[model samples]
Target: SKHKFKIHTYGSPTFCDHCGSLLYGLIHQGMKCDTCDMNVHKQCVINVPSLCGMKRGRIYLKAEVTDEKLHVTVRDAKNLIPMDPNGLSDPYVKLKLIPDPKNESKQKTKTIRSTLNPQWNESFTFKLKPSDKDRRLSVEIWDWDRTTRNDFMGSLSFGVSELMKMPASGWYKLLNQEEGEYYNVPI
Candidate 1:
């Protein structure tokens, strides 16, 4: 079902109806389906599945750069898209800083196998220099198949310059590869 997305807003903190991330702005956070009540981020509607008569799930992250010490908490993920032959994936999260020169910018959450929802309430802290602001942080969700490189399930990215609002912690949308609006950047 094609959700006719229209510009919309909310009075209180509103998390995206698709990805778990919060709709992080006041001006025009995202849109609501003209056909249903689904509230998805501006760039998320396309990646959101065709369940217009339905609902959602999430991930979490928090922010506050106190002296360049960037702490990223790999909270959890739910309602993951089933891509395996068995209807679920042995998933995990991989974190990296794009354009990282030292190659020390790669990190990951332990694999939470055989489940669509995973709880990895772990945190990783990294030093982000002033110049690193130009580089975006890539947060990806992958299926853990022990051979020939794990299958790529989904991914999202955002520059380290910005993070959250509505106070929710998370990355971008799934089933998509970083396409966004000119005036609307992903969080």
Candidate 2:
């Protein structure tokens, strides 16, 4: 009997055979074998028995601080994992500054409809203080659904200091929170 396999895209509770880790959200791309129903990360595609050609997406962002104001621009995301079975997802992004007891408002990008890759080109500005040295920036990608609550696609969080250490702008990989939380400490 022939078997049908499902691709466990981001947001699903799928694990990678190669790394033996959960492929939650958009941390990595994976393919499930139709015959054996085995899931493997795209990096481990060659090790799997089936042909898996999916690729993980990336996000582009630039962060800077001037005159006590922190500015961050979310440029784009590419090759995102589709949350829907039809191979598409309505995507949006949420940005937050962690350890903010003042409850500053979080920022969000406009939802882009029905596409695995999206371009936001949106910028957010926040007031900063010297006390914010230990604070980190958090970004979460979500799939919008009309009939139900939005689904988490992936996320990346890093220290403001780390952003400052890099060049003015660059592409960064989304990290899995459950695997290990990354926090930026004061220098």
Candidate 3:
């Protein structure tokens, strides 16, 4: 009995069946049906709404991060200005997002080789919660070349996305891996 959780149905306006919170806003329309009207945030339906707070593993945007120091490294510096053909005045910097050496995992190791090469310096992954039922994502960076290049690289495993057919497009759906309605484990 303890293992089984009750599934509450939502009413006409559509509410959060999971937490029984009244749903408000057109952003989350047409989600729940009549029988089991369990309507949640559109972000929740797709999975990743914003900010994570769980713990096992999570993904974060470099822009939204600012507490802990990242395990950073200068992967390479290539001269790319045709004007400065000598290859010294215009050296482009590339950084690596390898797993923290102090805390390692086989999943992280498998991606190390790919992250080092010049093919896709902006490669990374995000881990999804084991609870997700429908879909999952695994992004692969095949090529990247530009002037100001500061990209995040790591493994992110999260819920499925309706927007991306492949992870290479730089946008995908992820479940909110936090405890509250919109929160995730801090990285």
Best TM-score among the predictions, by candidate number: 2
Cα misplacement distance, residue 64 of candidate 1 (Å):
3.4
Best by lDDT: 2
Clashing pairs in 1: 60-169, 61-169, 61-170
- TM, every model: 0.59, 0.64, 0.17
lDDT of 1 by residue, 46-115 (tens): 5667777651234555544556766777777777765455666778878777776787788898999888
Q: Residue 71 in candidate 1 has what lDDT?
A: 71
The Cα error of candidate 3 at residue 69, in Å, is: 10
For residues 1-187, what per-residue lDDT tens digits would candidate 2 score against the true structure? 3323455566657766543455655654676667666776554454333333432366887778776777889999887766665667789988877765676848899999999789999999878667666778777778888985575666676776665565246776654443213632121
Q: What TM-score number comes out for model 3?
A: 0.17
Candidate 2 has which clashing residue pairs, if any?
Answer: none
Clashes of each: 3, 0, 19
lDDT of 3 at 31: 49
Provide the lowest-lDDT 10-residue window in model 2.
178-187
Provide the lDDT at 4 for model 3.
Answer: 19
* C-alpha RMSD in Å of predicted model 1 compared with the true structure: 12.3
| RMSD of every prediction | 12.3, 8.3, 19.5
CA displacement after TM-score superposition, residue 120 of candidate 2 (Å)? 0.9
